[PDB]
Amino acid sequence: VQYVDASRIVIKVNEDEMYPGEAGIDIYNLTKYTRSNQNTCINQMPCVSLGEPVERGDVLADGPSTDLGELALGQNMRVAFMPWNGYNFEDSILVSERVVQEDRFTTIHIQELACVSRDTKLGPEEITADIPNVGEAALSKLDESGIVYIGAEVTGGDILVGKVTPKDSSLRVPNGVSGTVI
Amino acid sequence: ARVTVQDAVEKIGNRFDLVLVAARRARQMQVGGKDPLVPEENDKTTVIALREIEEGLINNQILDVRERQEQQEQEAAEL
């Protein structure tokens, strides 16, 4: 491993593996947080550091739900098989606040919101933040052009873009949805 | 608060009839300015009406008599 980073991993291949011409390094650009087909997160986490001898076929970086090259769907958690005050009545499950405190089962969810400017009648929709009759706090999160700044925490009902009905059409966070704009 | 209506069904045998008689009294209590005869223990009008039936303060016959008396009072107001 010549160089390792959360974004990318550089392996310097052994000379025997190396082809005679134009060879000697293998660069793997790890995919960072990306929107999954089921709205989860595909995160590629490196599991090796500098100088670690990596053999052919070895796993350089764990994928989502992957731990040191082993599939890790969930968390091995402490289980007590007892009926506790009826909280676990039919098949219900108690969980300690310790689990939430340690973020044991917390999961990142990626939701992709698309606002489309269209060639409407009486002029096209305007993506620029020309929208009137809006709160100043909502405009503050938006940039000059109306697009929300990267990494700005937003809450359901907050404006994210600046689409204007040709003379209020701007996309807003769906209610109950919150979080940074990756 | 009445969480059980069994005493009210004793007062009105049909039980389905108890919903109808209580509804008329409750409507009188809410839409109309009618004082709750039963003391209001932080109760909504529907519960007060059920309590009045359980008390026996209000029954289908009693509600009819009160409505007839109000009609007579309206004639007295007309003078």
């Binding site: 769907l73 969930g74 968390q75 091995n76 958690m77 402490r78 289980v79 098989f81 007892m82 | -």
Partner: protein, 51 residues
């Protein structure tokens, strides 16, 4: 071709844990010991996407 119960008993015996697999447990709230020692161990747990 997985482990038989005897192998699990031996593995428990390797640790300080009782071979029976039942560990005496105490209520968090009252602080009174439960009768009939309960089963405690780590089982893999999955959160499902039906949040």
């Amino acid at each position: 071709d997985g482990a038989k119960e005897a192998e699990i008993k031996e593995l428990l015996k390797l640790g300080d844990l009782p071979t029976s697999g039942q560990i005496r447990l105490y209520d968090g709230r009252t602080g009174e010991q439960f009768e009939r020692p309960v089963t405690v161990g780590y089982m893999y747990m999955l959160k499902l996407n039906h949040l």
